[PDB]
Amino acid sequence: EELLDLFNRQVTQEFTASQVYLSASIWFDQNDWEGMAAYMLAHSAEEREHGLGFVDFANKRNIPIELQAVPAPVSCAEWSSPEDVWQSILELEQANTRSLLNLAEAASTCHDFAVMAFLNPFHLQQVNEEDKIGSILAKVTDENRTPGLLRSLDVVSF
Amino acid sequence: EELLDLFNRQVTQEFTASQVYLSASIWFDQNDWEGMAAYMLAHSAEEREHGLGFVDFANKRNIPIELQAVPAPVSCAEWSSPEDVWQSILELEQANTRSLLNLAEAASTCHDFAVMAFLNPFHLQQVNEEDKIGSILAKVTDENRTPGLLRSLDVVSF
Amino acid sequence: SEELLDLFNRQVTQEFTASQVYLSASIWFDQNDWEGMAAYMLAHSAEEREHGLGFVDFANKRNIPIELQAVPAPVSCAEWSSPEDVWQSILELEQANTRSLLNLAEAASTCHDFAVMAFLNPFHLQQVNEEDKIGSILAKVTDENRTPGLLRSLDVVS
Amino acid sequence: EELLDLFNRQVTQEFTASQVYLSASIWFDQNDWEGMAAYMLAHSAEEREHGLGFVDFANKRNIPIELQAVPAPVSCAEWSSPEDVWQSILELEQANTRSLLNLAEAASTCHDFAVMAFLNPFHLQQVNEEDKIGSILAKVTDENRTPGLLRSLDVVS
Amino acid sequence: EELLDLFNRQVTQEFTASQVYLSASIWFDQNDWEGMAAYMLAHSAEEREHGLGFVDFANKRNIPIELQAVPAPVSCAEWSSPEDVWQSILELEQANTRSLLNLAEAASTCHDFAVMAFLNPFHLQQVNEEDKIGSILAKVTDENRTPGLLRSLDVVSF
Ligand SMILES: [Fe+3]
Ligand SMILES: [Fe+3]
Ligand SMILES: [Fe+3]
Ligand SMILES: [Fe+3]
Ligand SMILES: [Fe+3]
Ligand SMILES: [Fe+3]
Ligand SMILES: [Fe+3]
Ligand SMILES: [Fe+3]
Ligand SMILES: [Fe+3]
Ligand SMILES: [Fe+3]
Ligand SMILES: [Fe+3]
Ligand SMILES: [Fe+3]
Ligand SMILES: [Fe+3]
Ligand SMILES: [Fe+3]
């Protein structure tokens, strides 16, 4: 039952993340960072696709899915610079990584080899995501040390 | 008669706007902002096309058009930085939006459903224009906080 | 509102009535060796029928019950003696088609039937274009018919 | 500087003419001359393009441009036939030509070889335009001697 | 004879300019401005082509050409920033313009219509060159107000 639970909760986690990304895109769009806004919107969609992935596997493997409330994103209250937004997104992915590792540990305890196999590509994708977001946040933080310079690279990049 | 009046005045408004854009392109060209100058020139042409759109509809709908003087653009006297120019263009579009909404309210009072239908795409285009110009002005203002940096993005962008 | 439903039904009848009137014009023209005007009338007869079918299809989707009425015998051909008579009748028919569309829209507006208003929008615009075209053809017919044989020599052209 | 002033006035002249062409297109469309209307509309765009060409050269050559008002066209009030319209448009082109010639002479007095070179294709274009306009006006005026006949040829070109 | 003289001297002027451009490319290359160096090198070639143009016309028109020494470029002694180099190039083109205008005035006095015709495209090209170089110098001067920023646009641009 704990495994089935954690599986169900990973869907919520992916959908929660989707909404957080959407919130980041709104913040960026409202503050005229259209390039960062596009990035966040695309990633919102990707997180939804992850959750649907979990759903589909669950259905095939007879793991009951019950859809939970997708909480309101509330880090957009705190956000006052692009740096704040990217820092929250990095924490969000760090948590998504932790939630997948916990799920895998439950599967491992249960000898659920199909669930572990299913999760392998996600483990590796999370490594790539954390690295990419990490690297973006480092660039944002460095470029923002000179007034207007960050803007100058929402244009160029993204 | 008020409807016909306001319709006729929208043509003047579009042509007025066309000339303001041309004036902005001249200011930018003379001050070696060729990328912003190109943007303004293109938009000058677009505003002319809008006015011709109104003219064509008027002719088809038997709304008498009498062409009015197209005033001299005079905000180019005040302009001393790209920020001043973009601020004027934003106000210009805000006024173009207001003039279309007033026209639509007159059509609405008159139950002139064809005029309201005609205006729908313009209403939505104005939303997009104000948002784009708004976003440009925000970037200009931010980048101009560091000497030479704005220049560096007339090149890259535009 | 049962009355809005009546008006929508009545538009169907009006389109099919116009289709038959266009057909009657085609016949007159063909009988009198104006094959070019005849072809224009036949094509426009088909197009009015397409409009009526468009209304029926929307009505079916929107649960507006349709009761198909009699399509009355066109009566104007009894009195037509020149192409000018026929084009004037056709202009009058389109002016009527327009007034009934506007009556339907006013009812929809009163009932807050946003979907019906939206549906009608392209038709309001098409009617502007049709009246303008018809009116223009009538003006050319009238002018060319001041010289014997000249109108014929342009059934051959347009 | 007479040269700078005349260069500025030439821009206003081109946009003025653009509006006059637009007004002709209006008169024609209102009176169901869709062919002549389209010709006039196309020419209105072309006059504006000419003015833009002057603007562009002026910016390159550091000739300060101050955009003036574009005066409302006033000929339409008196037009009652296509002939009247074509006649006003001929007169408009003849004035466009005289003002180019005045600008060229001022350039010539100043030994402004760049401005004179710039103007050469416009002098040749005016010759072509005056000829074309004049020819259309001749055709209009002849065809309009028979009722309906002119209409029967808006439809052709 | 003065006309023939001035014609011969225009060849020297074009070749002199070619060498000045080459000197500018060397300065830029040695100071690691490869993008500005490429621009100068290309323009060096273009000035040579202009001189060869004059030569070819002269030969066809029986204007004796005697090739003069092409002086050593010596503004590269003074150069210490990209701004100094572009300022010299602007002066160089301003002088090339003056030399063409003087030539045209001699042709004009002599009623040498073929020489004036030959020169027309050069007059217009000089207008375009002065404007372009002017605009580059303005950008250089603005961007160089922030340390490293100019560099950042030798890369992007050019
Ligand atoms: Fe995810
Ligand atoms: Fe993710
Ligand atoms: Fe992912
Ligand atoms: Fe507009
Ligand atoms: Fe606009
Ligand atoms: Fe627009
Ligand atoms: Fe009823
Ligand atoms: Fe009923
Ligand atoms: Fe009924
Ligand atoms: Fe119809
Ligand atoms: Fe119809
Ligand atoms: Fe129709
Ligand atoms: Fe012109
Ligand atoms: Fe012209």
Ligand SMILES: [Fe+3]
């Ligand atoms: Fe022209």
Ligand SMILES: [Fe+3]
């Ligand atoms: Fe040269």
Ligand SMILES: [Fe+3]
């Ligand atoms: Fe050169």
Ligand SMILES: [Fe+3]
């Ligand atoms: Fe050159």
